[PDB]
């Protein structure tokens, strides 16, 4: 799936909209383990 | 087929069997003797119709004067307090303290009140302060809102001061032009919230005067797409700001101007008419080129009609378009040179067309220019035109401050049917030296005090009148402010098809059965003149199944503090009433002892009318327990009764003895009678007595005697009345209850006719069959019908199984021919407040058409032949004497196999009457005499351009 | 055409109704292999026009040729890929 | 003027006048969202 996303960006489909969706202020699934309360901390500024 | 003589004698035997059984078992003459036996426990008092109406009209005028005084005392403070306001622009330090409804703060502090529950209010309230309502689309904490939120805090003290003299005061509300509404007493607001105080009918009438609106809709090609959807929505949401005093019409133009509907001239814009225009608006398509000269020429011609009824007031043209390069200045210089017609122009949609000519059109003609880019701006831009129309009224001054009253409508805070007073509030800042005059020509808001219809009903007592007598007040427009047929439900229009904000405006001719004489009475009341008329009227029964004709007397006078007119309907035999006089201690204890639930085995099952005997005895709607509270109050209270009226308690106690003395002396001797299942006595005092305890469990009638359909019907008739049971397995009662027969007693005290009670029995159907037989023949059919064409005694077993059914649903061929030969007349009428199950294109309100059948000809013997296809069917019709029954014999339907359409007598959903032809000959009405428009001192220099 | 004809015709409406539940509908599983709507009170039946109003689909030769030409110009090809992922599954469409 | 069929929104890439036609043709040449304008033009003539 990551390789498919990278191919999508390589063809330049909506790469800027993918980039805008990886910023720090994002929700991530409860399946991953994290401290309760801080739920929107996942996501990084290095996406740009 | 037996001869006429042999069938006349056959029915002669049975009419003696039925009458004698009801005469003796019920004991009609025994009750008459009991009333005449004493003649000293009560006195006969006259019932002067002329005196009653003036007294009742004086109380309504006085009641509406307390609220009028509570409004001028409330609007004067608002004008003075606001003129002293300083317009602070920073509330972070001096926060505003207020209670905001619909809740559990940058520049405000919230209040948590106490919220005590009380009576005369369906909800929990608090007299400590006043709640504030702010619309969802209005941000609290803005400078405009916060400044208004300060100077209105001075209304709290005058809210309390108003309520101290009159503790019976309902909601007092101030609707500001900023959007917020502050009402007293504080109470929580009532899904999302869409209430805006500026769009309420009580706010709109005080904002401006009646108007002759005329909406011009651009249906050229350029408006196709999204901007047509907004035009149709803006027009629909703008007709919602038109009351019954405003006349509107809608036109469209695309190289040719035409009406969008069936009206062709200005119509009254009531609930029904506005539905037609609204339906016709969501049908228009965009096509063609734009022609403004033809559109405006057609619009200016309808405003100058003067043949039809109009408002003779504000004349305004509304232009819903997008943009163009045509100014049409040659038309405005021809049709309105004196600027007697305002032109408001709306530019709707997202576009780049020239709005210059649209802006210029609204500036020369004292109008205003509005922008509606999206749906969010539709609701607010379609109500700001009342700021322009209120300009001449502000400059009038003290002569424009007149209290007005709305149409009857349902209160927003779930209070029931109410009417609201109205009085505008003006800017006064700088008026002492008369130097500002810039924003001073726009109203601050509207003041209002609610009056409930139950408040008015307490000023017109009806328990000294006959159950057929009632008060009914009218309106200039003809609608009823007070009527027994007015229900707390919205009036329906059309048919509800699926794939409360409107007022309850019920016309007088729609409340009861229309008549040529009654139209004259309605017109004489509208123009405000007293009078009186006695005439024969045919009256619909309480249950919409029978029609009976009896003499009535209408007495009306105008309530000439306000513009209402009060009338009192009063039949004959009710100009006198039984007034109870009794102060002896032991004669009331014995009478009250008859009300004990324990000894029903010796006095019969007893019901009590839930009247307001005393203020501390709450109505229960149970009667099983309510009687327990009533009689336990009698022995636990001093018989002097200083807090509640003895007149309403002396009557019920006096009727308690009379009903019991019939049971003990007469009914007790005959424990069981072959043809009798129950015996009941219903009196004017308000009690019912069913002798058998077991048979007293089947009494499904209303405990209140004034609401009993058979009681009211038996007074009009001078003979035994047979009431057919219901059908469709509507609970129990078909065989185990019986057939109800009633006969009102008539007493002559001093040459005066009086009908204080009714008596009757319940004839068992199974034992009546045995008498009737002395059977299931395939070649002959014999049925008995009452006044209304309902089966009461059949012959074919299966026919008897479907007892109490309309004859047209079991033998349509015979019933239709009966109507033609003039034995069963019928009169159709509409019910505008009804709820019906919707069909295809829970439940919704709708109009349902009612049909009632009754005896047309006085003649008793009928005969003839009906032809239903190559066959000859003969029948004989004889009517029972001293009874509303008719016996019909005809040979069975098997001989002639024909079956036409069924004739239904039921609450059938309809959409009529047609509104396209009612506007051709509308009912008479009188418009308001106040007309505030075309003032020379008006500025109107801010057309649409200073704002952008 | 050979692999898939008329697979993008099943969006999840409301129960016992004819109105699409979502504002941007996507196909269900054709045979219970792709995507299933699990919204409270939703079910899907073959009575949907298509993703782009019926313009983008593989149920005709002209429609298939238009879709192929649209995808070969690297314009909206991922949209068709994801719609076929919703319809069929996650194994066949990515190769095509 | 045939791009007024949606009735729910206003479309920016149209052929309403000469400047907008030039902008839309340039956008089609660059290849960005040319299929969206093609769909709009197809639905302007009735549909699929
Ligand atoms: C009854 O009438 C009186 C006067 O006839 C009226 O009081 C007047 O209220 C206005 C506010 O609308 C005051 O205007 C002052 O001057 C300007 C004009 O708005 C304001 O400055 C900015 O104005 C822009 C609009 O152009 C506005 O968007 C912005 O928020 C304002 N503030 C900024 C940019 O900081 C002033 O703030 C405003 N107030 C001052 C200077 O204190 C008039 O001064 C008022 N006139 C008098 C004599 O007091 C009153 O509102 C009317 N009643 C009601 C209910 O509206
Ligand atoms: C708009 O809001 C203003 C502030 O929220 C109100 O102004 C304040 O009103 C208080 C009481 O009315 C004043 O308190 C007293 O004022 C009198 C002068 O009349 C003096 O004795 C003192 O200043 C003071 N007394 C005390 C504190 O014991 C405030 O002075 C006054 N101003 C402020 C707080 O800045 C306005 O009343 C209000 N407008 C309306 C119409 O209610
Ligand atoms: C309506 O107003 C009139 C007068 O304004 C009231 O007429 C009174 O009628 C009685 C008897 O007919 C006279 O004794 C009074 O003298 C009249 N009043 C005056 C001022 O002359 C009439 O009562 C008012 N309507 C009601 C319902 O009270
Ligand atoms: C009613 O309106 C019409 C036109 O809107 C007025 O014009 C007259 O119409 C009647 C026939 O309908 C005729 O007398 C003439 O054809 C018209 N002119 C004149 C001078 O009468 C009409 O005056 C209005 N009023 C009435 C009572 O018809
Ligand atoms: C109620 O019913 C009566 C009886 O059918 C109707 O009035 C009759 O109308 C016919 C023709 O329309 C006349 O020939 C009769 O003379 C009328 N009888 C009357 C006036 O007593 C009509 O449907 C209703 N009448 C009302 C409401 O007054
Ligand atoms: C699309 C290629 C593509 C781009 C991003 C992502 C995926 C494919 C096709 N072509 C379209 C035209 N463009 C260029 C272009 C550059 C060189 C030669 C021809 C065209 C263009 C378009 C309009 C105006 C100036 C320049 C170059 C690419
Ligand atoms: C002949 C006829 O109408 N019979 C009715 C039936 O239609 C109805 O369903 C039922 C109610 O339970 O009452 C009975
Ligand atoms: C936990 C919860 O209540 N979620 C709902 C449940 O109530 C409902 O019965 C079910 C029916 O599909 O959908 C889910
Ligand atoms: C209010 O109206 C009543 C009549 O309904 C009247 O008796 C009374 O004087 C009026 N005023 C007050 C303050 O009660
Ligand atoms: Ca792209
Ligand atoms: Ca145009």
UniProtKB/Swiss-Prot annotation, chain B:
Disulfide bonds join 363-931. Keywords: Calcium, Calcium channel, Calcium transport, Cell membrane, Disease variant, Disulfide bond, Epilepsy, Glycoprotein, Intellectual disability, Ion channel, Ion transport, Membrane, Metal-binding, Phosphoprotein, Signal, Transmembrane, Transmembrane helix, Transport, Voltage-gated channel. A divalent metal cation binds at residues 218, 220, 222. One of its GO terms (molecular function) is metal ion binding. Glycans are attached at residues 66, 150, 283, 307, 427, 434, 551, 560, 622, 728, 771, 820, 827, 857, 870. Residues 1-945 are extracellular. It holds the Pfam family VGCC_alpha2. It is a single-pass type I membrane protein. InterPro entries: Ca_channel_alpha-2/delta, VDCC_a2/dsu, VWA_N, VWF_A, vWFA_dom_sf. GO terms for cellular component: extracellular exosome; GABA-ergic synapse; L-type voltage-gated calcium channel complex; neuronal dense core vesicle; plasma membrane; presynaptic active zone membrane; sarcoplasmic reticulum; voltage-gated calcium channel complex. Binds gabapentin, an antiepileptic drug. Belongs to the calcium channel subunit alpha-2/delta family. This is Voltage-dependent calcium channel subunit alpha-2/delta-1. It comes from Homo sapiens (Human).
Curated annotation (Swiss-Prot), chain D:
Each of the four internal repeats contains five hydrophobic transmembrane segments (S1, S2, S3, S5, S6) and one positively charged transmembrane segment (S4). S4 segments probably represent the voltage-sensor and are characterized by a series of positively charged amino acids at every third position. Expressed in pancreatic islets and in brain, where it has been seen in cerebral cortex, hippocampus, basal ganglia, habenula and thalamus. Expressed in the small cell lung carcinoma cell line SCC-9. No expression in skeletal muscle. It comes from Homo sapiens. It is linked to Sinoatrial node dysfunction and deafness: A disease characterized by congenital severe to profound deafness without vestibular dysfunction, associated with episodic syncope due to intermittent pronounced bradycardia. Primary aldosteronism, seizures, and neurologic abnormalities: A disorder characterized by hypertension, hypokalemia, and high aldosterone levels with low plasma renin activity and an elevated aldosterone/renin ratio. Other features include generalized seizures, cerebral palsy, spasticity, intellectual disability, and developmental delay. It comes from the Eukaryota. Signal peptide: none annotated. Residues 1-48 are extracellular. Belongs to the calcium channel alpha-1 subunit (TC 1.A.1.11) family. CACNA1D subfamily. Ca(2+) binds at residue 32. It is found in: Membrane. Voltage-dependent calcium channels are multisubunit complexes, consisting of alpha-1, alpha-2, beta and delta subunits in a 1:1:1:1 ratio. The channel activity is directed by the pore-forming and voltage-sensitive alpha-1 subunit. In many cases, this subunit is sufficient to generate voltage-sensitive calcium channel activity. The auxiliary subunits beta and alpha-2/delta linked by a disulfide bridge regulate the channel activity. Channel activity is further modulated, depending on the presence of specific delta subunit isoforms. Voltage-sensitive calcium channels (VSCC) mediate the entry of calcium ions into excitable cells and are also involved in a variety of calcium-dependent processes, including muscle contraction, hormone or neurotransmitter release, gene expression, cell motility, cell division and cell death. The isoform alpha-1D gives rise to L-type calcium currents. Long-lasting (L-type) calcium channels belong to the 'high-voltage activated' (HVA) group. They are blocked by dihydropyridines (DHP), phenylalkylamines, and by benzothiazepines. This is Voltage-dependent L-type calcium channel subunit alpha-1D.
